[PDB]
Design an enzyme around this catalytic site. Structure first.
Site, short mmCIF file in Angstrom:
data_model
loop_
_atom_site.label_atom_id
_atom_site.label_comp_id
_atom_site.label_asym_id
_atom_site.label_seq_id
_atom_site.Cartn_x
_atom_site.Cartn_y
_atom_site.Cartn_z
N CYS B 105 -74.84 -34.06 -26.49
CA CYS B 105 -75.88 -34.61 -27.35
C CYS B 105 -75.28 -35.44 -28.48
O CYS B 105 -74.54 -34.93 -29.33
CB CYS B 105 -76.76 -33.49 -27.93
SG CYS B 105 -78.24 -34.10 -28.82
N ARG B 108 -76.87 -34.92 -32.65
CA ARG B 108 -76.79 -33.64 -33.33
C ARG B 108 -76.68 -33.74 -34.86
O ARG B 108 -76.77 -32.71 -35.53
CB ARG B 108 -75.60 -32.84 -32.79
CG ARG B 108 -75.85 -32.23 -31.42
CD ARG B 108 -74.61 -31.51 -30.89
NE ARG B 108 -73.67 -32.44 -30.29
CZ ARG B 108 -72.42 -32.11 -29.96
NH1 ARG B 108 -72.00 -30.88 -30.16
NH2 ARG B 108 -71.61 -33.01 -29.41
#
Ligand code: HEM
Ligand code: HEM
Ligand SMILES: Cc1cc(N)nc(-c2cc(CN(C)C)cc(F)c2F)c1
Ligand SMILES: Cc1cc(N)nc(-c2cc(CN(C)C)cc(F)c2F)c1
Ligand SMILES: C[C@H](O)[C@H](O)[C@H]1CNc2nc(N)[nH]c(=O)c2N1
Ligand SMILES: C[C@H](O)[C@H](O)[C@H]1CNc2nc(N)[nH]c(=O)c2N1
Ligand SMILES: [Cl-]
Ligand SMILES: [Cl-]
Ligand SMILES: [Gd+3]
Ligand SMILES: [Gd+3]
Ligand SMILES: [Gd+3]
Ligand SMILES: [Zn+2]
Lengths: 401, 401
Positions: B105, B108
């Site tokens: 990801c 974040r």
């Protein structure tokens, strides 16, 4: 054996070749370090015996008389001398396998088409220089580039190493500046300082070709200027952006890595420069647009009249694409071999299939194989890969200073 | 034992001490790296204990008052019931930490701002649909997207799981042909065949939003037509290419993954849909230009009158960039939150520096953090990264069939 999926096609293979990976890499089940750039007679015998096995498999003489006799020849030599000598055909085969085994090389469809110059009789830095000039002359071939390697004497007990101190045969000077910046290529500040320290009178342009620092065993390195006529270069222009030529950008035709170690059957060749031809992204994207390199991206985007004050205009992407176009156009105009990232990755897919049929897999470093622009537009992005070390191999080695 | 990590743009060095805590082994070994692969009874107490310790350290309450007390009640709960229930605040903290720990990801930097809906008192697909509908409407928020996760009841033996059968809450249909090939999204040919199998009237178009298949424990799934005013979509136009609208392209506002399994403190939630907002390359590059997705790249190039006859014109790269422009332009004009890959990666670098100080490192998956266009134009390309598994986590899981 690891299962490997291609997500564009859906197809699936198993990399059985990885099971034979000799040396060890940096990852564990605890953590993956895949993204890191830089990751005794009985054991020499062990590597030699395996390579000799490789060579005799390749000539369809596995388990032959000649095969056993060569095994015993190498054992006798190591017992008697602590080392052994490659036959010329074994060196040629070893050099090609090193290329074939290099996980970060996208150009490996060509691995079998390699010209091997055997300079293992080289005697001095002066002779080394002549060999290097002939390599450059042959490889460049007036713009129709040819892959080649020159192998200088192997590391051996009792004598120092031959070393080329330059990281490539053709490199542009990087001059630390008045205010603290760099004029020229910042990747080459250190070698540039070494060259001056060793008697090179510097220039002060952005594209000054460095001299060679050549080291014979147990010798200080020796400065050698390359004859300007051996160093083919390409002025950079853009097919539709006429102002681009006024940037005064250039690049050189020949990519010749000169600081890597060639290992074959446990023997180590610390000087063995190799050359192929450029993929356009190396120049257009990395060399010219890396912030820590020539860093032209913003100046090109301003000239393009892009809106550089907001990232969402994608001015960076647009200017970088036209820099890559300019590189490709300029090398084609100059009639200098170059390959774009689409064709190169499409040929690397054929290599992976050839290698699947031939060896049961192919060591490949996804982060280096996928190009630095337009990653998922190329077929290799959607190809899972297994990275591992096979020998013969090109290895990194410390700088000699 | 503490991997050295370097940023090649600045030359700065850090050490990832947090990697030492990695529990679940990854797929890599010293012999081979598999980092590019997409998909590689009372042990419950050690995971619960560990997660509770994590909770109390994050609130400066380790070795005090409610820490020991909460340690005993989870023991008792497991001793009596063979499992335990999370305190609401622990569920909140666990969801945030699973997002924080997601190596793939890039968003974040947002991990501390997450709205957690507690659906642990749910029963039946009808109730799920109401939760999912509250989530979507809250997350969408008229285009001002807000990150959200709805946590359905945890898993326990003897009782089947809660599962959302769709990979996302918004998916376009993929319809096969009188010739195999696919109209609509080929990523969803299969869930489109299931929905049709379960009673859904298919459409004809290339952008029909699929209905949901929601599964209560030990009951077959039920179709649910999503409220059409709850699905915010963005028709795609280009700021200067007037014909781009006529291509009829659309995408939806809310990326809401609905097939991943949330694991906190040993407890497993097979149905925990999380959503945020798109990064523009996700739509403009992968969804629209992957050959196995909408594969629109040549259609746009034809419209731009590009030379598709040679790869070296970089027609693929030019068309790609304009499609990404059109996504960013359309979403901004529709006032729907989106982030371009330059802004997103620059914020990720900020995140790494935050996480270096707070926790001594950050698990990052280089191949997934680097965007799929203009990779080396972003700073994350030049950052070495360490990949490893921390808990709590979002974990993949089998399709429920
Ligand atoms: C013939 C055309 C060739 C092409 C198109 C090509 C392409 C490339 C590219 C793009 C890279 C990545 C370099 C970087 O990003 O800095 C690379 C790496 C590499 N190539 Fe090839 N190459 C060619 C020829 C060769 C030859 C002839 C050899 C050796 C005999 C070779 C061995 C290697 C090795 C060892 C690396 C790894 C370098 C490193 O790890 O830093 N290549 N190649
Ligand atoms: C707030 C804006 C967010 C942005 C811009 C963002 C961006 C991204 C991107 C680009 C990916 C790659 C996925 C792919 O390529 O298919 C990803 C993966 C992921 N994201 Fe985020 N994300 C956001 C919010 C969230 C939230 C709120 C959560 C959870 C609560 C989350 C959890 C994950 C997970 C678990 C993955 C890995 C999924 C996989 O491996 O397929 N993200 N994110
Ligand atoms: C033989 C060969 C062909 C080719 N096309 N590239 C390379 C090559 C280039 C660089 C420089 N980079 C900054 C681009 C670094 C390496 F390690 C290489 F191996 C070598
Ligand atoms: C919360 C969130 C935000 C965001 N921007 N993307 C995702 C996301 C998207 C996909 C679809 N891909 C094919 C693009 C797959 C995943 F696994 C994700 F996690 C999730
Ligand atoms: C840190 C990161 O691994 C580094 O920038 C790598 C990534 N991939 C690369 N890929 C190629 N071909 N060449 C490179 O120099 C790099 N650099
Ligand atoms: C084979 C390769 O690992 C695969 O295509 C990965 C690479 N990186 C990715 N990165 C993101 N963000 N999303 C993806 O789907 C992928 N796909
Ligand atoms: Cl280079
Ligand atoms: Cl998506
Ligand atoms: Gd003009
Ligand atoms: Gd000026
Ligand atoms: Gd017309
Ligand atoms: Zn790895």
């Amino acid at each position: 054996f690891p299962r490997v999926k291609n997500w564009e096609v859906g197809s699936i293979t198993y990399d059985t070749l990885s099971a034979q990976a000799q040396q060890d890499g940096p990852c564990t089940p605890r953590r993956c370090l895949g993204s890191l750039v830089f990751p005794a007679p009985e054991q020499l015998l062990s590597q030699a015996r395996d390579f000799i096995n490789q060579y005799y498999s390749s000539i369809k003489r596995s388990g032959s008389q000649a095969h056993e006799q060569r095994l015993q020849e190498v054992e006798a030599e190591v017992a008697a001398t602590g080392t052994y000598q490659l036959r010329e055909s074994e060196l040629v085969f070893g050099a090609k396998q090193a290329w074939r085994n290099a996980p970060r090389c996208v150009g490996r469809i060509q691995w079998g088409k390699l010209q091997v110059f055997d300079a293992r009789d080289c005697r001095s830095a002066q002779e080394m220089f002549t060999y290097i000039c002939n390599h450059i002359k042959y490889a460049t071939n007036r713009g129709n580039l040819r892959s080649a390697i020159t192998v200088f004497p192997q590391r051996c007990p009792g004598r120092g190493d031959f070393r080329i101190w330059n990281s490539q045969l053709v490199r542009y000077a990087g001059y630390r500046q008045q205010d603290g910046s760099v004029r020229g290529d910042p990747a080459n500040v250190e070698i540039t300082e070494l060259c001056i320290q060793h008697g090179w009178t510097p220039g002060n342009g952005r594209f000054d070709v460095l001299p060679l620092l050549l080291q014979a065993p147990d010798e200080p390195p020796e400065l050698f200027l390359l004859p300007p006529e051996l160093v083919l270069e390409v002025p950079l222009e853009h097919p539709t952006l006429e102002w681009f030529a006024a940037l005064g950008l250039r690049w050189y035709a020949l990519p010749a890595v000169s600081n890597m170690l060639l290992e074959i059957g446990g023997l180590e060749f610390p000087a063995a420069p190799f050359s192929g031809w450029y993929m356009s992204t190396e120049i257009g994207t990395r060399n010219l647009c890396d912030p820590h390199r020539y860093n032209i991206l913003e100046d090109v985007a301003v000239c393009m009249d892009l809106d550089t004050r907001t990232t969402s205009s994608l001015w960076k992407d647009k200017a970088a694409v036209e820099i890559n176009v300019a590189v490709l156009h300029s090398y084609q105009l100059a009639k200098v071999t170059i390959v774009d990232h689409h064709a190169a990755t499409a040929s690397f897919m054929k290599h992976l299939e050839n290698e699947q049929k031939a060896r049961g897999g192919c060591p490949a470093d996804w982060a280096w194989i996928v190009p630095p622009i337009s990653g998922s537009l190329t077929p290799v992005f959607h190809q899972e890969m297994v990275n591992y070390f096979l020998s013969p191999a090109f290895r990194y080695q410390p700088d000699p200073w």
